[PDB]
Design an enzyme around this catalytic site. Structure first.
Site, PDB file in Angstrom:
ATOM      1  CB  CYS A 116     -10.223   3.518   5.083  1.00  0.00           C
ATOM      2  SG  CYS A 116      -9.268   4.110   6.554  1.00  0.00           S
ATOM      3  NE  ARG A 171     -14.066   5.264   5.390  1.00  0.00           N
ATOM      4  CZ  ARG A 171     -15.192   5.039   4.715  1.00  0.00           C
ATOM      5  NH1 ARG A 171     -15.645   5.977   3.899  1.00  0.00           N
ATOM      6  NH2 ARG A 171     -15.855   3.887   4.846  1.00  0.00           N
ATOM      7  CD  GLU A 174      -4.426  -2.699   8.921  1.00  0.00           C
ATOM      8  OE1 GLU A 174      -3.998  -2.440   7.780  1.00  0.00           O
ATOM      9  OE2 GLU A 174      -4.507  -1.839   9.832  1.00  0.00           O
ATOM     10  CD1 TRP A 184      -3.786   3.418  14.620  1.00  0.00           C
ATOM     11  CD2 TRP A 184      -3.171   5.561  14.401  1.00  0.00           C
ATOM     12  NE1 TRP A 184      -4.862   4.198  14.970  1.00  0.00           N
ATOM     13  CE2 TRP A 184      -4.513   5.517  14.839  1.00  0.00           C
ATOM     14  CE3 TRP A 184      -2.568   6.804  14.190  1.00  0.00           C
ATOM     15  CZ2 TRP A 184      -5.257   6.667  15.069  1.00  0.00           C
ATOM     16  CZ3 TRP A 184      -3.303   7.944  14.424  1.00  0.00           C
ATOM     17  CH2 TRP A 184      -4.638   7.870  14.859  1.00  0.00           C
TER      18      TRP A 184
HETATM   19  C1  HEM Z   1      -5.114   6.204  11.220  1.00  0.00           C
HETATM   20  C2  HEM Z   1      -5.317   4.889  11.332  1.00  0.00           C
HETATM   21  C3  HEM Z   1      -5.803   4.016  10.150  1.00  0.00           C
HETATM   22  C4  HEM Z   1      -6.271   2.774  10.299  1.00  0.00           C
HETATM   23  C5  HEM Z   1      -6.440   2.018  11.634  1.00  0.00           C
HETATM   24  C6  HEM Z   1      -6.616   2.263   8.994  1.00  0.00           C
HETATM   25  C7  HEM Z   1      -7.149   1.019   8.733  1.00  0.00           C
HETATM   26  C8  HEM Z   1      -7.372   0.506   7.476  1.00  0.00           C
HETATM   27  C9  HEM Z   1      -7.623  -0.875   7.141  1.00  0.00           C
HETATM   28  C10 HEM Z   1      -7.679  -2.053   8.135  1.00  0.00           C
HETATM   29  C11 HEM Z   1      -7.803  -0.956   5.819  1.00  0.00           C
HETATM   30  C12 HEM Z   1      -8.071  -2.256   5.041  1.00  0.00           C
HETATM   31  C13 HEM Z   1      -6.785  -2.519   4.265  1.00  0.00           C
HETATM   32  C14 HEM Z   1      -6.377  -3.959   4.362  1.00  0.00           C
HETATM   33  O1  HEM Z   1      -7.168  -4.761   4.909  1.00  0.00           O
HETATM   34  O2  HEM Z   1      -5.260  -4.307   3.903  1.00  0.00           O
HETATM   35  C15 HEM Z   1      -7.666   0.371   5.248  1.00  0.00           C
HETATM   36  C16 HEM Z   1      -7.797   0.728   3.913  1.00  0.00           C
HETATM   37  C17 HEM Z   1      -7.553   1.973   3.363  1.00  0.00           C
HETATM   38  N1  HEM Z   1      -7.079   3.093   4.040  1.00  0.00           N
HETATM   39 FE1  HEM Z   1      -7.089   3.289   6.108  1.00  0.00          FE
HETATM   40  N2  HEM Z   1      -6.324   3.246   8.061  1.00  0.00           N
HETATM   41  C18 HEM Z   1      -5.816   4.347   8.730  1.00  0.00           C
HETATM   42  C19 HEM Z   1      -5.381   5.515   8.130  1.00  0.00           C
HETATM   43  C20 HEM Z   1      -5.484   5.867   6.802  1.00  0.00           C
HETATM   44  C21 HEM Z   1      -5.007   7.105   6.198  1.00  0.00           C
HETATM   45  C22 HEM Z   1      -4.242   8.211   6.972  1.00  0.00           C
HETATM   46  C23 HEM Z   1      -5.318   7.068   4.884  1.00  0.00           C
HETATM   47  C24 HEM Z   1      -5.073   8.110   3.768  1.00  0.00           C
HETATM   48  C25 HEM Z   1      -4.850   9.407   4.014  1.00  0.00           C
HETATM   49  C26 HEM Z   1      -6.024   5.820   4.628  1.00  0.00           C
HETATM   50  C27 HEM Z   1      -6.518   5.412   3.407  1.00  0.00           C
HETATM   51  C28 HEM Z   1      -6.965   4.129   3.128  1.00  0.00           C
HETATM   52  C29 HEM Z   1      -7.390   3.634   1.831  1.00  0.00           C
HETATM   53  C30 HEM Z   1      -7.423   4.439   0.519  1.00  0.00           C
HETATM   54  C31 HEM Z   1      -7.739   2.352   1.972  1.00  0.00           C
HETATM   55  C32 HEM Z   1      -8.271   1.440   0.848  1.00  0.00           C
HETATM   56  C33 HEM Z   1      -7.118   0.714   0.193  1.00  0.00           C
HETATM   57  C34 HEM Z   1      -7.605  -0.685  -0.056  1.00  0.00           C
HETATM   58  O3  HEM Z   1      -8.520  -0.846  -0.908  1.00  0.00           O
HETATM   59  O4  HEM Z   1      -7.079  -1.629   0.595  1.00  0.00           O
HETATM   60  N3  HEM Z   1      -6.104   5.119   5.818  1.00  0.00           N
HETATM   61  N4  HEM Z   1      -7.416   1.235   6.304  1.00  0.00           N
HETATM   62  C1  LIG Z   2      -2.462  -5.232  -2.635  1.00  0.00           C
HETATM   63  C2  LIG Z   2      -2.511  -6.394  -1.654  1.00  0.00           C
HETATM   64  N1  LIG Z   2      -3.229  -6.075  -0.400  1.00  0.00           N
HETATM   65  C3  LIG Z   2      -2.557  -6.729   0.739  1.00  0.00           C
HETATM   66  C4  LIG Z   2      -1.113  -6.280   0.869  1.00  0.00           C
HETATM   67  C5  LIG Z   2      -3.264  -4.623  -0.195  1.00  0.00           C
HETATM   68  C6  LIG Z   2      -4.030  -4.243   1.058  1.00  0.00           C
HETATM   69  C7  LIG Z   2      -4.047  -2.738   1.090  1.00  0.00           C
HETATM   70  C8  LIG Z   2      -4.111  -2.058  -0.116  1.00  0.00           C
HETATM   71  C9  LIG Z   2      -4.120  -0.672  -0.127  1.00  0.00           C
HETATM   72  F1  LIG Z   2      -4.193  -0.016  -1.298  1.00  0.00           F
HETATM   73  C10 LIG Z   2      -4.054   0.027   1.068  1.00  0.00           C
HETATM   74  F2  LIG Z   2      -4.068   1.371   1.069  1.00  0.00           F
HETATM   75  C11 LIG Z   2      -3.983  -0.648   2.271  1.00  0.00           C
HETATM   76  O1  LIG Z   2      -3.920   0.069   3.439  1.00  0.00           O
HETATM   77  C12 LIG Z   2      -3.661  -0.570   4.683  1.00  0.00           C
HETATM   78  C13 LIG Z   2      -3.532   0.490   5.751  1.00  0.00           C
HETATM   79  C14 LIG Z   2      -3.204   1.795   5.408  1.00  0.00           C
HETATM   80  C15 LIG Z   2      -3.090   2.749   6.408  1.00  0.00           C
HETATM   81  C16 LIG Z   2      -2.731   4.172   6.063  1.00  0.00           C
HETATM   82  C17 LIG Z   2      -3.307   2.378   7.728  1.00  0.00           C
HETATM   83  C18 LIG Z   2      -3.637   1.058   8.029  1.00  0.00           C
HETATM   84  N2  LIG Z   2      -3.858   0.670   9.308  1.00  0.00           N
HETATM   85  N3  LIG Z   2      -3.735   0.151   7.041  1.00  0.00           N
HETATM   86  C19 LIG Z   2      -3.973  -2.037   2.288  1.00  0.00           C
HETATM   87 CL   LIG Z   3      -0.030  -4.354   6.099  1.00  0.00          CL
END
Ligand code: HEM
Ligand SMILES: CCN(CC)CCc1cc(F)c(F)c(OCc2cc(C)cc(N)n2)c1
Ligand SMILES: [Cl-]
Ligand code: HEM
Ligand SMILES: CCN(CC)CCc1cc(F)c(F)c(OCc2cc(C)cc(N)n2)c1
Ligand SMILES: C[C@H](O)[C@H](O)[C@H]1CNc2nc(N)[nH]c(=O)c2N1
Ligand SMILES: C[C@H](O)[C@H](O)[C@H]1CNc2nc(N)[nH]c(=O)c2N1
Ligand SMILES: [Ca+2]
Ligand SMILES: [Cl-]
Ligand SMILES: [Gd]
Ligand SMILES: [Gd]
Ligand SMILES: [Zn+2]
Lengths: 402, 402
Positions: free
Chosen positions: A106, A109, A283, A278
């Site tokens: 993420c 963070r 993305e 958000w």
């Molecule tokens: C507030 C603005 C936030 C932004 C801009 C953001 C951005 C991102 C992005 C770009 C990813 C990569 C996921 C992907 O490429 O599909 C990600 C992953 C992730 N986010 Fe954040 N996020 C935000 C908030 C949060 C919040 C509030 C949580 C949990 C309380 C969170 C938990 C996670 C987790 C666990 C992942 C890893 C899931 C994965 O492996 O794809 N995020 N986030």
């Molecule tokens: C399983 C297939 N891929 C593509 C759909 C999953 C990518 C993905 C897996 C996860 F577990 C996620 F939490 C995730 O979070 C995207 C995200 C989450 C939040 C809170 C904010 C943000 N700005 N973005 C994104």
């Molecule tokens: Cl998405």
């Protein structure tokens, strides 16, 4: 203690926090698997529960204290009486923030300290699930001034079913297979879409039909719920100077709300704990719209821009992608929906790394996911070495319920 | 089992069985991945030599033959008598090709079978070394029709110093440390520039001054050799439609020739073995020209383009970087100098992965280096999971000889 270098500035840090890595990752001295997306009783639960409480009381500067020792004996007797234990609401809030703080992939963070935790541990039945989820969506959407939130449903416990949200996100566009083999809508959502059709939903036929929710209370089959359209804030996409972009009919939704991950705190497991923040603009504009296995609109936009698509070296793909991301940014700002571009986001994550170095000696980060999917090396995170490891509390992937 | 590897664009999966043969250990452990870090004897020699000989006789479909058995015994006897051995000419050619094939950070490995191998193992002086290097540059440049080549200088042996090329590449631009602390020219080359001056080079004062070579013969201080200007082909940079771009006075050179890595073949070590291919445009247009710690031209180009550089959300960085890459490709094509854009290069690397799955059951690949620094997910390698591991023969980093 790994030596971590920033190659833009030359600065060195040492990640001492990685020594606390509680679980094992997929890599070995023989081979690195860091690019793989998914990389593979009473005594057990108590060790994890004890470790989390020590974390909690250390974090509030009350370690070894009176309240510290009382909680420890509380969870011991609770597990002895019931086979599990219940978090205090404050421990729940702390664990939810830490699980976000600990997510290596993420980039957002910097915001980890600001998270609204909605306690749904008293939920029973899917109808109450749906009400909790709608309240989450309304709170988190906030008319476009997005606010981070999580809703925590009852934990897994032995002998009982699980609370599960079958959808991977709260807002997902349907994907329908044609007899010409292709998909109309989001190809990522073909499986969930036909499950919805199977479980009662009558399907639309647009490229952006918002799916219903398949909510599952313990041991009951999943129930089909439709989201009120007024609840689901969407942004029609236009471009600041390409007047024809609006006519492509593209749109995306305001709220990224992941609903299929498992939240682990102190050895307890919450299989239903959807969270939202958000969007970062790549993305939507790069991955969701331009991945070849998603909406795959890059060539459509390039033809409208009159680009030379028959030679790669004109960089028509790169120019089309940039304008799609411009359109996303322009449209969200025009609609007053919170969005952050990949430059601002990676700059804030750098600050997060600096803050986290002082706060606990390191930060688990997964370079491949932190670096944006366009303009990688134009962002500071590209030049930052990172160390990826697993800390608890944590979010984890989990098997689909079916 | 072996690591399961998924392509997310296509949905296809492979298993990397080749990784199970990895010899040298990498930096990762189950506790933590360090994949993002840039830089992380009788019996031992015989096992490596025997395995290499086995590799060689496999390649010519003569495994287990009389000739195979006799060469193994011949290597064994020479190691017994002398502690080391000599490669046959054919083995040296095969070994250099294998070291390129095995290089996990090289996206150009579709070409690995086409490599001109210059045998310089009878080199005896820094003057002879310079002649070999000038022959290499002339051969490989070929007036812009670039040809891949490696020149292999004498192997390390006990009781005699190494041959070394102090320069990191055969062609590099001077980086002059300014009295301010700034740099004129290439900041990556400040150290090698100051070593050239200290060793008698009269320095220039431009941004694109080709450095001399510091060549080290065994047990000798390095000796300075000026490359004849007609040997160093350069490309003035211009843009196909931004006519002011030519006025920036930017140039790059034709020939990417890495000269500071160690080539290891069958336990033998060649500390001087410069190799060259042709450029992928993002190396020049994105990294060399737009890295903040390199020529750092991005804001200047964006200002000239009349982009709004006061807000990141205009994506002015992305737009300027794309046009700079366009200028690079256009200018090399205009000058008739081989160059490959990042789309074509990554598409050919996908073909390489498929060839290697069939030939060897996998391919060592470093995702973070294979994915290009702009437009990452627009290329197919972004969506390809990869396994990183060390095979031999290999190119290896080595300490700077000063
Ligand atoms: C507030 C603005 C936030 C932004 C801009 C953001 C951005 C991102 C992005 C770009 C990813 C990569 C996921 C992907 O490429 O599909 C990600 C992953 C992730 N986010 Fe954040 N996020 C935000 C908030 C949060 C919040 C509030 C949580 C949990 C309380 C969170 C938990 C996670 C987790 C666990 C992942 C890893 C899931 C994965 O492996 O794809 N995020 N986030
Ligand atoms: C399983 C297939 N891929 C593509 C759909 C999953 C990518 C993905 C897996 C996860 F577990 C996620 F939490 C995730 O979070 C995207 C995200 C989450 C939040 C809170 C904010 C943000 N700005 N973005 C994104
Ligand atoms: Cl998405
Ligand atoms: C023929 C065209 C070639 C292309 C387009 C190409 C492309 C590349 C690129 C883009 C990189 C990453 C470089 C960086 O970012 O610093 C790289 C790394 C590398 N290349 Fe290739 N290459 C080619 C030929 C060769 C040849 C002929 C050899 C050796 C015989 C070779 C060996 C390597 C090695 C060992 C690395 C890794 C070096 C490191 O770790 O920094 N390449 N190549
Ligand atoms: C050392 C600082 N950075 C940038 C200068 C990386 C240096 C570097 C070290 C190596 F060992 C390399 F093989 C390397 O490959 C660049 C390259 C090589 C070849 C044959 C072709 C190509 N198209 N490109 C680049
Ligand atoms: C194969 C590769 O790991 C996969 O495509 C990853 C790479 N980096 C990523 N980075 C982000 N932010 N999101 C992703 O889905 C991915 N996918
Ligand atoms: C810190 C990070 O590993 C570093 O900046 C890497 C990332 N990927 C790269 N990829 C290539 N091809 N070349 C590089 O120099 C780098 N640098
Ligand atoms: Ca049919
Ligand atoms: Cl270079
Ligand atoms: Gd038109
Ligand atoms: Gd013009
Ligand atoms: Zn690893």
């Amino acid at each position: 203690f790994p030596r971590v270098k920033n190659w833009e500035v030359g600065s060195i840090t040492y990640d001492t926090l990685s020594a606390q890595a509680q679980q094992d990752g997929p890599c070995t001295p023989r081979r690195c698997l860091g690019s793989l997306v998914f990389p593979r009783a009473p005594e057990q639960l108590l060790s994890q529960a004890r470790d989390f409480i020590n974390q909690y009381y250390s974090s509030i500067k009350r370690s070894g204290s009176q309240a510290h020792e009382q909680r420890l004996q509380e969870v011991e007797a609770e597990v002895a009486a019931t086979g599990t234990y219940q978090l205090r609401e404050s421990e729940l809030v702390f664990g939810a923030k830490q699980a976000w703080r600990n997510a290596p992939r993420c980039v957002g963070r910097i915001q980890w300290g600001k998270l609204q935790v909605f306690d749904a541990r008293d939920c029973r039945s899917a109808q109450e699930m749906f009400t909790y989820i709608c309240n989450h969506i309304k709170y988190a959407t906030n008319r476009g001034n997005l606010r981070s939130a999580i809703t925590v449903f009852p934990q897994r416990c032995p002998g009982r079913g699980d609370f599960r949200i079958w959808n991977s996100q709260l807002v997902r566009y349907a994907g329908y297979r044609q007899q010409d083999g292709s998909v109309r809508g989001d190809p990522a959502n073909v499986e969930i879409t036909e499950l919805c059709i199977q479980h009662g939903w009558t399907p639309g036929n647009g490229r952006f039909d918002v799916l219903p929710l398949l909510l599952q209370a313990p041991d009951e089959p999943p129930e089909l719920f439709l989201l009120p359209p007024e609840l689901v804030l969407e942004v029609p996409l236009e471009h600041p100077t390409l007047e024809w972009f609006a006519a492509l009919g593209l749109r995306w939704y305001a709220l990224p709300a992941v609903s299929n991950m498992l939240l682990e705190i102190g050895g307890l497991e919450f299989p239903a704990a959807p969270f939202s923040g958000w969007y970062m603009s790549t993305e939507i504009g790069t991955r969701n719209l331009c991945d070849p296995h998603r909406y795959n609109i890059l060539e459509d936009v390039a033809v409208c821009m009159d680009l030379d698509t028959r030679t790669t070296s004109s960089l028509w793909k790169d120019k089309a992608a940039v304008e799609i991301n411009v359109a996303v940014l322009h449209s969200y700002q025009l609609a007053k929906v919170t969005i952050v571009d990949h430059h601002a986001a990676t700059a804030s994550f750098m600050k997060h790394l600096e803050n986290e170095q002082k706060a606990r000696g390191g930060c688990p980060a997964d370079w491949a996911w932190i670096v944006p999917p366009i303009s990688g090396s134009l962002t500071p995170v590209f030049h930052q070495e990172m160390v990826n490891y697993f800390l608890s509390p944590a979010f984890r992937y989990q098997p689909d319920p079916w």
